[PDB]
TrEMBL record, chains A, B:
Compartments it resides in: Cytoplasm, Myofibril
Lineage start: Eukaryota, Metazoa, Chordata, Craniata, Vertebrata
Similarity comment: Belongs to the TRAFAC class myosin-kinesin ATPase superfamily. Myosin family.
Name of the protein this chain belongs to: Myosin heavy chain 11
First-to-last residue of the parent protein present: 919 to 944 of 1979
Protein source organism: Meleagris gallopavo
Origin superkingdom: Eukaryota
C-alpha cells in the first residue's frame, strides 16, 4: 500500500505538471 | 495507508477531469 501510495503521488505530481502546462498555454 | 491511497486516487480523478476540461479549452 505504501508502494501504491508512492506510485499515485508520483502520477499526481505528473498531473500537476500537466495542468500547469495547459494553464500556461490557455 | 489505504485511506491515503483512496484520497490520492480521488484527487487524481479530479485532476483527470480538470486536464480534460483544460485540453478542450486550449
Amino acid at each position: 500500500l505504501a508502494a501504491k501510495k508512492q506510485e499515485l503521488e508520483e502520477i499526481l505530481h505528473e498531473m500537476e505538471a500537466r495542468i500547469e502546462e495547459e494553464e500556461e498555454r490557455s
